[PDB]
Write a protein that binds this ligand. Structure first.
Ligand SMILES: [Zn+2]
Lengths: 240, 49, 84, 60, 49, 69, 166, 182, 70, 90
């Protein structure tokens, strides 16, 4: 908790490896001099007068996107240029890391329905500029169409069993063409009766009948049981 | 013609003179273009000319 | 070592021719890094020779089983051409 | 004049207990099976992370 | 160029009928819908968009 | 019009006549016997095995026909 | 000033790390596939339907009597392409593929090569049970580790690589 | 010329400004880059000779297998091509169609045998040296690189004396004798 | 072991170097001998190819590096 | 660059050689050539994290090499393995 660790750029831009004895995964903070969640920060010093900039450790046991990253995804669509629509943003657990891997230029429209995590989310959101808090139900993107414009990736950490309709309606309303789609599927919350990759097959087929072509999936097994990260792209024109 | 259509029974013409709906005997009903080489997007006037 | 006579090493074509520090914590740390480097080198040399001796038996087992499967397939096509 | 036999093979349940124990620890290497989640506090995955390797199945 | 761009098949619509389309009727006041009845007994109202 | 060297080559044998092909990009030179055609920067591209000699070249520009006699 | 050894310059006739090894499934044991259990999802294909009709074995009751569980037969629309392209000698197979029990998938790949679509959307998931009768497709399937496949023979389906068949 | 679009590439397939059919794959250009041939037409004044000897071997095979004119002239031609070193063995007359090559009659040139016996280190440097006038075969100096050698004269390919490359290599070995003026 | 016993394929311990001749110790056995002899064959072979290069020196051997080498 | 490469020229080599730094880890195999862009940096501790993984004030050795020099049991393992390597290599 006080030792010295080197940094290195990952394959995905924006996210960094912190190689020490063990090697963490980390991101570059938007709001220095603070820790929102309770994670450890590694602070480096750039040498002009010298600056002190800090890097928040991304916990893969607490955020499914960091589970998918160091489980190994071939590509994201959360680049440091893009804009990200975070369906089902509970708290500042993962949305802070997605925010500061997007960076100071691009926005993360985080949505949420429940009110207590929503109010601590907006109290998080006052401290970094680039995220937009939404306190609406995700089933009706019509009642927040006023305020999000043409996002070029969607992430979905919603855990209710009408996920396909959720992501279909939101991607039709706001996701631009050839845009990214990243889904976290939880089999025990879709349906506990039948088994995990059976419901993964169901949801993959519902995606490609909603013409989100799925490129890639991952089980993220050493971190969480029975979830799957499905990456696809909104084809919208020539699914074949 | 296509290999999967067979004994085509009811062919009608869509109300904008652009598509040909062919309902066959094997069950399927298909769409076709009328002018088979044109395309159905708006064209800049150099392409139109 | 490979010893050569002078009468043949003084007479050869050109291309095929056999052609301040601190006392203290600095040098003890440099010997420390030398220690961990020779530790790593002998360790992964052991690892690589273990892998090579493993693929020795892999090659032998695979070779004899493909030998017997190839003779079974050759007697299969032998009886197939024999039932003409 | 027998070969060297085995106390493991003496009990026909125990060898199936003591080779299921191996088959547990064999597929710790094949896949990365779930273990129980975050055991201590998160002090790193303790075993490395590599860049140029994605273990995610692609769709044709 | 038209012999190399003549790609007339658009696509079918739905998973098709059961027995075979024997009756088709476009509606004469709207563009993107037509009714379609197949001779097992099953009639449908297709949206063509 | 502007002074711009595009391709300047001394090839040792005699050259009777020469012409451009369709642009400045290609020019055919009728050398001592074999007719050669050349790129924009002076490299050669074809030694014509036919046109076993040449004295007058011309280019029919809409037909893309290099004619030799 | 003149350079040595010049050639008539002609055209040079010549001069003008994310590795991916797919991880084995979470459903997979060594070769058991511990996550297929009733009710099964049975992929179908063309020669299976033709052979089933010429052996007069019903589809859903045949699968229930072969496997003693509820089977959901699943036809890819890319294999219904081949079963349409077989022509008018197989209209029985066509109107028996059109069946509200047999719920059908949707593919996304150019062309209609049903064998590669089947082996691809199987080895993406390992939750399906393949019904077939093609010898080469059978060899592809029993090469990939641990899915079950069935095939009609005699006058009932037989099932190859599934443990709890009895 | 523009890396044409898909419909343009379909509408004209047979266009190729660079490589025509009658270039024969640009083999004259390729082998003269391979062997660093100075002048043009040297390939074809070799290829005329290659076609000439396969024409003459054709006519000699046409002549009947008993007469001494045919057998004497075919062993005479085979020994002449061995004495010019175009071949390497006194092989069959089938090698007068499988083995005579414009590459072989190039391979007996002076800079390529110079690089072959390691006098230079690349054939461009060999043409540099024998265009600067350093080498001789026997007594007489060679100025042009088109002089191909015979089977006899692959032994007296040596530099002239007072060639300062000869002086620098002898002083490299420090066997630089200077009574013999080099 | 197909049709043999462990006492049929047991062991054969190797005798050690004597104590009388123990000044030049470590009697070497057949595996030691082949370990020495293949190395000696290797050294003789590279000496032979060196002598062959030497007698085919061709003393017109010129490069450009013979102004750094001496 | 090669102006702080004197200070950090050891530690990246031992991070390359992490495979045998402690005989209880077995980090997975990758070569890890020294990257072109990197930066050293120290962890700072969560304020609720206390008594558990925070290193003390006089315990904070200001270099990873000094922190590794710290524990003489690890250095004892280094000593015994290097001694057996030396006697088996001489
Ligand atoms: Zn398909």
């Amino acid at each position: 908790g006080g030792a010295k660790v080197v940094i290195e750029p990952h394959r995905h831009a924006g996210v960094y490896i912190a190689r020490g004895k063990e090697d963490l995964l980390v991101t570059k903070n938007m709001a220095p001099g603070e820790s929102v969640y309770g994670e450890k920060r590694i602070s480096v010093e750039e040498p002009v007068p010298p600056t002190k900039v800090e890097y928040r450790v991304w916990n893969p046991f607490r955020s499914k996107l960091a589970a998918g990253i160091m489980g190994g995804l071939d590509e994201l669509f959360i680049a440091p240029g893009k804009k990200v629509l975070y369906l089902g943003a509970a708290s500042g657990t993962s949305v802070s890391h997605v925010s500061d891997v997007v960076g100071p230029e691009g926005v993360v429209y985080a949505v949420e329905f429940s009110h207590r995590p929503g109010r601590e989310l907006i109290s998080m959101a006052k401290k970094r500029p680039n995220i937009i808090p939404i306190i609406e139900d995700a089933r009706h993107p019509q009642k927040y169409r006023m305020l999000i414009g043409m996002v070029d990736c969607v992430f979905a950490d919603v855990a209710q069993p009408d996920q396909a309709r959720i992501i279909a309606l939101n991607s039709h309303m706001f996701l631009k063409d050839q845009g990214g789609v990243v889904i976290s599927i939880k089999a025990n919350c879709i349906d506990s009766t039948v088994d995990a990759e059976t419901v993964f097959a169901r949801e993959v087929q519902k995606l490609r009948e909603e013409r989100i072509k799925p490129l890639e999936q991952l089980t993220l097994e050493p971190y969480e049981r029975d979830h799957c990260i499905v990456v696809g792209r909104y084809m919208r024109s020539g699914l074949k | 013609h296509t290999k999967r259509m067979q004994h085509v029974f009811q062919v009608k013409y869509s109300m904008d003179s652009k598509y040909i709906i062919s309902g066959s005997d094997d069950g399927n009903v298909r769409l076709w273009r009328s002018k088979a080489w044109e395309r159905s997007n708006v064209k800049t006037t150099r392409e139109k000319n | 070592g490979l010893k050569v006579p002078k009468a043949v090493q003084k007479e050869l074509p050109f291309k095929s021719q056999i052609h301040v520090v601190l006392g203290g914590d600095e040098k003890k740390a440099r010997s420390f890094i030398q220690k961990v480097l020779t530790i790593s080198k002998a360790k992964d040399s052991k690892r690589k020779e273990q892998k090579a001796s493993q693929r020795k038996e892999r090659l032998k087992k695979l070779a004899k089983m493909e030998e017997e499967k190839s003779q079974r397939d050759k007697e299969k096509k032998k009886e197939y051409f024999a039932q003409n | 004049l027998t070969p060297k036999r085995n106390k493991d093979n003496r009990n026909s349940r125990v060898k199936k207990r003591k080779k299921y124990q191996k088959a547990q620890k064999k597929l710790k290497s094949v896949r990365a099976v779930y273990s129980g989640g975050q055991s201590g506090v998160y002090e790193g995955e303790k075993t490395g992370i590599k860049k140029g390797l994605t273990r995610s199945v692609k769709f044709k | 160029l038209e012999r190399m761009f003549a790609k007339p098949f658009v696509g079918q619509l739905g998973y098709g009928h059961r027995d075979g389309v024997y009756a088709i009727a476009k509606n004469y006041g709207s563009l993107n819908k037509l009714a379609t009845g197949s001779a097992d007994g099953v009639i449908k109202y297709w949206n063509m968009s | 019009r502007k002074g711009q060297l595009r391709a300047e080559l001394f090839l040792n044998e005699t050259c009777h006549s020469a012409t451009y092909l369709q642009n400045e990009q290609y020019f055919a030179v009728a050398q001592k016997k074999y007719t050669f055609i050349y790129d924009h920067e002076g490299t050669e591209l074809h030694r014509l095995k036919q046109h076993i000699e040449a004295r007058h070249l011309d280019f029919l520009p809409y037909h893309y026909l290099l004619v030799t006699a | 000033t003149r350079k040595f050894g010049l050639v008539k310059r002609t055209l040079n006739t010549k001069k003008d790390l994310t590795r991916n090894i797919p991880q084995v499934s979470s459903a997979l044991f060594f070769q058991y596939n511990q996550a297929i259990k009733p009710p099964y999802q049975v992929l179908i294909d063309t020669n299976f339907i033709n052979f089933s009709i010429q052996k007069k074995v019903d589809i859903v009751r045949g699968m229930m009597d072969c496997l003693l569980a509820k089977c959901n037969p699943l036809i890819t629309d890319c294999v219904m392409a081949e079963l349409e392209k077989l022509g008018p000698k197989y209209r029985i197979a066509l109107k028996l593929a059109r069946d509200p029990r047999i719920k059908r998938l949707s593919c996304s790949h150019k062309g209609t090569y049903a064998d590669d679509c089947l082996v691809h959307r199987v080895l993406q998931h390992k939750c399906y049970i393949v019904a077939t009768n093609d010898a080469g497709l059978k060899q592809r399937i029993r090469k990939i580790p641990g899915i079950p496949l069935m095939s009609v023979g005699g006058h009932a389906y037989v099932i190859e690589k599934l443990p709890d068949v009895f | 010329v523009r890396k044409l679009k898909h419909h343009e590439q379909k509408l004209l397939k047979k266009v190729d400004f660079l490589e025509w059919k009658q270039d024969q794959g640009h083999r004259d250009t390729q082998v003269m880059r391979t062997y660093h041939i100075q002048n043009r037409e040297d390939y074809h004044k070799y290829n005329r000779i290659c076609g000439d000897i396969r024409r003459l071997a054709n006519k000699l095979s046409l002549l009947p297998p008993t007469d001494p004119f045919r057998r004497k002239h075919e062993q005479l031609l085979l020994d002449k091509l061995y004495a010019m070193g175009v071949l390497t063995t006194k092989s069959k007359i089938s090698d007068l169609e499988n083995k005579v090559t414009v590459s072989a009659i190039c391979r007996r040139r002076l800079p390529v045998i110079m690089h072959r016996l390691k006098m230079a280190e690349t054939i461009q440097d060999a043409v540099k040296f024998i265009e600067q006038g350093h080498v001789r075969v026997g007594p007489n100096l060679i100025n042009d690189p088109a002089y191909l050698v015979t089977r006899n004269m692959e032994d007296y390919v040596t530099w002239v004396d007072n060639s300062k490359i000869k002086k620098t290599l002898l002083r490299y070995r420090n066997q630089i004798d200077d009574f013999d003026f080099s | 072991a197909k049709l043999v016993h462990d006492v049929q394929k047991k062991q054969h311990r190797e005798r050690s170097q004597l104590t009388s001749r123990s000044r030049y110790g470590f009697l070497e056995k057949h595996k030691d001998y082949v370990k020495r002899a293949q190395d000696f064959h290797r050294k003789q072979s590279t000496l032979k190819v060196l002598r062959e290069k030497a007698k085919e020196r061709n003393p017109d051997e010129y490069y450009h590096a013979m102004h750094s080498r001496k | 660059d090669d102006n702080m490469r004197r200070e950090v020229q050891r530690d990246l080599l031992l991070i390359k050689h992490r495979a045998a730094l402690d005989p209880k880890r077995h980090y997975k195999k990758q070569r890890w050539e020294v990257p072109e862009r990197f930066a050293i940096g120290t962890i700072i501790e969560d304020k609720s994290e206390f008594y558990s993984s925070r290193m003390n004030r006089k315990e904070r050795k200001s270099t990873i090499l000094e922190t590794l020099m710290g524990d003489e049991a690890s250095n004892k393992y280094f000593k015994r393995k290097y001694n057996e390597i030396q006697e088996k290599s001489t």
